[PDB]
Write a protein that binds this ligand. Structure first.
Ligand SMILES: COc1ccc(N(C)C(=O)[C@H](Cc2cc(F)cc(F)c2)NC(=O)Cc2c[nH]c3ccc(O)cc23)cc1
Ligand SMILES: COc1ccc(N(C)C(=O)[C@H](Cc2cc(F)cc(F)c2)NC(=O)Cc2c[nH]c3ccc(O)cc23)cc1
Ligand SMILES: COc1ccc(N(C)C(=O)[C@H](Cc2cc(F)cc(F)c2)NC(=O)Cc2c[nH]c3ccc(O)cc23)cc1
Ligand SMILES: COc1ccc(N(C)C(=O)[C@H](Cc2cc(F)cc(F)c2)NC(=O)Cc2c[nH]c3ccc(O)cc23)cc1
Ligand SMILES: COc1ccc(N(C)C(=O)[C@H](Cc2cc(F)cc(F)c2)NC(=O)Cc2c[nH]c3ccc(O)cc23)cc1
Ligand SMILES: COc1ccc(N(C)C(=O)[C@H](Cc2cc(F)cc(F)c2)NC(=O)Cc2c[nH]c3ccc(O)cc23)cc1
Lengths: 218, 220, 212, 209, 212, 208
């Protein structure tokens, strides 16, 4: 990744064994649950395209998901090439060549070119552009991997209300891929059990979740 | 977070993998015991709003508490807008735009903007303001996960007095959001709910006894 | 804590997760054995009062001990307000009251300013003294046995008995009377060998003599 | 490694104990799975030829693979000698670290223009490790066939895991046709019903069952 | 400890939590096996007297050994005093100053970073290691004379127990007098081979001769 | 060890706890498998003689090997004294000075940072590695001549044991012994390949 040194300059630094083992562990233990995505975004803070490909290359299984992520990256690189064409000719002195999509994805660019773009003034943040594409692809994986539907989650008989809300917003997080509403508010009350659903309407309009869960505490 | 450079300048550092894993382990082991909050504040020392959002996003379960946490933050952000409205217009050179509630919460602000606010002269501590709101919502969550009232904490017939006082003040800590409270009534409620053997010894000590004297007396 | 920047400059730093987890693990495993106190002092090296309150606040259990700790802190702060009872000259800082040392009515900026002043006032070191004074009481409380009740078993090795004698003595005292008390409660066999060595014998001589 | 300092200068650091431990534990757990190669490349960031030999020397088992690795390195080194026939430029044995000192390696890596003997040697190592991953792959891609009761996702998992070990981590037309051709007769109908050029997300939403 | 700053000046640093935990673990898993002493010296590299007292204070059990160590420290501080009985003449440390019982950290650093320096931490560590050597010897269970090769014991396992026992009995200080005992206590089959090797054989040759 | 600060100067550093614990755990786990030696050389990067004695002194068991190591060190130090006899000239180290038995830390640093340096730390590490090589060869349970492919053993497993054994003890002679000690089935396939076959070719021809 690109970090700041003691001269106030941005310089390249090798990716650390801890960051690599942390990314491997969250994938082994949590597959593609929605919370994996912010963890990926945090562990790849300051990453170059080479680093992002490194982290993605340490995933041993889930190869169908990885191939989908590649097809998503290829569609974002094609759109980048449409909106930002590369002009022919020699590069102005002290400047970098224009990055095409395959440069941002680290397939046709060198590490030194990635450093050049990311530390230029102004910087062309090819690590952040590529990471947006990867998170777009991973969000589509989180939805495809989600088992139950938000419509399916209905409260049990003797199940406490807080456990039903737990399963509710967890499934909702996988359905929207951690994207954040009276639509989901009315689904919560509708799919409850008859005992609490009666008191929920009696609370009034636009009650807070705190108020709802105090009303169905017992 | 934003840390002191060896030069002495406030500069942005990435959130460390050790910090991320520490917060994940605290939530999975301690759930929402009261001591989780000072651990959250200590692990998020110097955090930007983006870091705070990152720590909350690593929480896998407790999604009910997380939705309730969002609702507390929205109510604090709406209150920040009422007190500090944004003066419309262009921003003077070398200045930052006035932050609104969603900027402090990190939903309509960028990382570069949060860095500018926190390292400005004088600083606008959008990271500290956001953490104050998060702790307010976490206070509610600690009370919700601690259902047992302090009135229902009663020493068992053969329970050691020290274990009874432990359950008493840990229950009192969740109810009172870890706020320091000197109050005679709770100190007499402690003696009121001791078992008959230690209650006899405590009354034979006289009123206004310190906690150390009380625990020494019921050491048997 | 307040640490050493390479420019000889005193800078504030966040408590690391390693220190936080270390102090938590020490209390969970060792409770309040006497060795917890020097571990707290060493883990709080260079601490502002806010840092000390943070370490105390991460303790999950032992809330009876923590309430006792507060009662000692309040009684020590009440004595500081006696011995060191408003305008503030430019460049300088206010004078600290007991609640300022404990970090209840003071900020991190006021604390850092006190501990980096040209005439320094170590509010963290004064606070740490108050905390250790309270941790000592908690260690005496948690010691299950008095030093008088430590007696060598009939078949217990002299080494194992002296281990319990001095571990108890450490918690109680958180000397000739201890030496006479040590030989007086050895089992009868070891006892007369101790009387046979004469007085003024080192512990190394005593333990190698009781080896049989 | 030859890494950036803090005053903007390239200096030589000792290999970190945490790095050596991470490499040893990766080999013990993953053996020679395809993901071992990018892991080796990330942990050898900036390494000199001496550092690379150190990493390979910490491998305890797999001494058959380590000997094939040596034979790949010898082939690359001999080809380097032929392509660079006789500032003294490094020979193949110099790049491999058998005839060069640590000072000569640093002097090559930090010259201007540099001769990156660490990156060259790492290229030969990765080429040798790729032949080992390919050799130790259990199954050919042509024998991956969807089970009658196997969910389509699990079949695509095995297909690309096998293809990664076969092609040694290198959308091809022969693979897109092979994936449809070896699916069970039920999903193979639904796939050809979508038409040509369907995305994998479309093919897995259809045969989601 | 006292460490080097990039400014070239010797600065004081807080003892790290990883160093503290490493020392607590060593004492808990090895007790007073001989190799604990070199691990203690390495973990206390650069230590001040205050740091050395911290490491000793984190030892949980073994309080009989800790009291023995104090008695060794007092004796060395007394001998130091007997061996050490102008405008700007620096006050030199007493035995209690080196041990840290009567000196502040500021005074300790003053001696350690003076020109010329007085390494009170290295002097104190010298006394501690002496007392630790005494504890290692006393804690050694078996005498070197009772180390005998079993009838079906491999020669290498016997030599392992022999030299490990010898290390505790000598506290890791430095002989054909040991080679004689090694040969004499080998079982009859390996002893016949060792005699046939003639005198002056290396250990390497002895273990290769007794492998079958 | 001796590492450089941010002034281009070589400075002394306390050996770290993480390095010490790593070397202790290496000896506990792997004993004296051949890879212990390059692991030692890597963990003692830049070490002084005092730091090398520290690493060896923290080994708990294997005292038979540790005494063998002392006898190897004594032989190398005596040979150094033979090859450097006594005759603003700097005093040069003796064998006991390189081993750290008669030299202080300040003298070891003075040698290692002098211009030009006398690297007593690297010279000592050379002697120690020579001694560890004898130990690894000693601990080697089986001769290379006794590694034979079982009648049901996969050829890859036989080659794994063969080269792991050859590594502990230490080429056309080895390629002969590898083919000679294979079971009669794979030995027929190997001899039918002809000369010049790589190990990759041999393992492919006998993978069945
Ligand atoms: C309302 O104020 C906001 C609103 C958005 C944010 N941002 C920018 C975030 O990234 C927040 C941070 C966050 C996480 C938390 F667990 C609890 C909080 F209080 C805040 N994360 C999510 O939205 C992702 C998420 C978590 N669980 C879900 C359930 C269903 C779903 O569809 C999405 C989610 C901050 C403040
Ligand atoms: C009277 O002296 C004070 C008073 C307040 C403080 N401040 C500023 C704190 O943050 C202290 C730090 C602290 C923690 C500790 F566990 C033991 C100590 F001795 C000090 N935190 C708590 O009090 C929070 C707390 C813990 N358990 C409780 C049970 C019931 C309850 O209602 C609250 C709590 C310092 C000194
Ligand atoms: C005599 O020389 C001295 C005397 C005092 C010190 N100081 C300044 C200390 O802090 C020492 C450091 C220390 C600890 C150790 F376990 C072994 C050592 F050898 C030294 N700690 C204790 O006294 C605390 C202690 C431990 N066990 C006890 C049993 C009974 C008791 O009442 C107290 C204790 C240094 C040198
Ligand atoms: C031919 O190209 C070379 C040749 C030598 C080197 N040097 C300078 C090394 O230090 C190499 C590094 C190495 C290790 C590896 F496991 C695989 C590689 F490909 C390279 N180590 C060994 O030779 C030690 C060794 C490991 N197993 C053995 C089995 C039998 C034996 O007798 C010795 C060994 C580099 C390149
Ligand atoms: C199409 O966009 C690209 C294309 C190539 C890259 N580069 C430069 C890489 O190194 C990528 C990084 C990567 C990994 C990932 F698992 C998922 C992603 F989306 C990206 N690795 C692989 O290609 C190796 C690989 C993994 N599984 C396979 C299955 C079969 C196979 O034959 C090869 C592979 C980046 C972007
Ligand atoms: C002969 O060359 C020397 C001689 C002395 C040294 N010095 C200065 C040491 O500190 C050495 C370092 C050392 C340790 C090692 F395990 C193996 C080595 F080769 C060297 N330590 C010991 O002697 C302590 C020791 C370990 N096991 C023992 C068994 C019986 C016994 O009575 C003592 C010991 C270096 C080189």
């Amino acid at each position: 990744p690109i970090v700041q040194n003691l001269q106030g300059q941005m310089v390249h630094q090798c990716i650390s064994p801890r960051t690599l083992n942390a990314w491997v562990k969250v994938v082994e233990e949590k597959a593609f649950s929605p919370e994996v995505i912010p963890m990926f975004s945090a562990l790849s803070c300051g990453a170059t395209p080479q680093d992002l490909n490194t982290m993605l290359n340490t995933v041993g299984g889930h190869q169908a998901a990885m191939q989908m992520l590649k097809e998503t990256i290829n569609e974002e690189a094609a759109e980048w090439d449409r909106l930002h064409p590369v002009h022919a000719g020699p590069i102005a002195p002290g400047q970098m060549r224009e990055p095409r999509g395959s440069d941002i994805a680290g397939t046709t660019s060198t590490l030194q070119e990635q450093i050049g773009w990311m530390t230029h003034n102004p910087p062309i943040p090819v690590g952040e552009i590529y990471k947006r594409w990867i998170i777009l692809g991973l969000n589509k994986i989180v939805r495809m991997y989600s088992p139950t539907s938000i419509l399916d989650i209905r409260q049990g008989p003797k199940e406490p209300f807080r456990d039903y809300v737990d399963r509710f917003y967890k499934t909702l997080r996988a359905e929207q891929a951690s994207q954040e509403n009276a639509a989901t508010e009315t689904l919560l009350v509708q799919n409850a059990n008859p005992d609490c659903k009666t008191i929920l309407k009696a609370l009034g309009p636009g009650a807070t979740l705190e108020e709802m869960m105090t009303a169905c505490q017992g």
